[PDB]
Symmetry: none
């Protein structure tokens, strides 16, 4: 599966994931590609901020889905 | 950050926000907790009705601040 | 709603109000536009001097109404 | 040399290997002991998924090392 991520600055990043991947596995791939600490990642989908424990399937995230990544601190 | 909201009927509601949260993010949390449409929310602070575009920091709203929520239609 | 205000000197001022606005909310908008202390405002409508506590609807003030503003001290 | 393998279900399996053994020789011993098709084996060490072509020495896997075996499909 592939999914996409958009940032508050307009930039998109592609990621290869699996329907079983947890949310903490998703930002941790984001830590491999862009270097952002996972603790400093907010991932937003269909109006809910994702929780590290659940999975992509849990949140009904399929192929071609676009998440939102807000950074905080 | 936490802030508070008082109503013309004497009831207070607690909200967890951030100094970067916009005013439209604030009533939209109020739409999650009490069900009121945001378009039907007036938020009043230090004598000014808040504007959806600005932020809590913009209006100098810190931790422990109390807003006022007037409903119209 | 819009209403109008005339002065003993012939000058008119427009105000945007609501049928629920009290009389003390009306002069206080007048304190924002012209700087006159509200305690120094008399508002006259259909032969009665308005009371701070009542409302525009209470006095049957509709859209397009013209009030009279007498200043005292 | 001996190395160990842990599964997402908590079970460990011992294997006898050599520092020259490739990763495809390692899952293929796993196909002899537990019957899992090698194509259906993920082998994870020090944060990297191993590649069939490289060797145990290539990935700095010594005696007493513990790998991780994730099954997919």
């Amino acid at each position: 599966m592939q999914i996409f991520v958009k940032t508050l600055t307009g930039k998109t990043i592609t990621l290869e994931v699996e329907p079983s991947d947890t949310i903490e596995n998703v930002k941790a791939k984001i830590q491999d590609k862009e270097g952002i600490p996972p603790d400093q990642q907010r991932l937003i989908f269909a109006g809910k901020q994702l929780e590290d424990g659940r999975t992509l399937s849990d949140y009904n995230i399929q192929k071609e889905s676009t998440l939102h990544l807000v950074l905080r601190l």
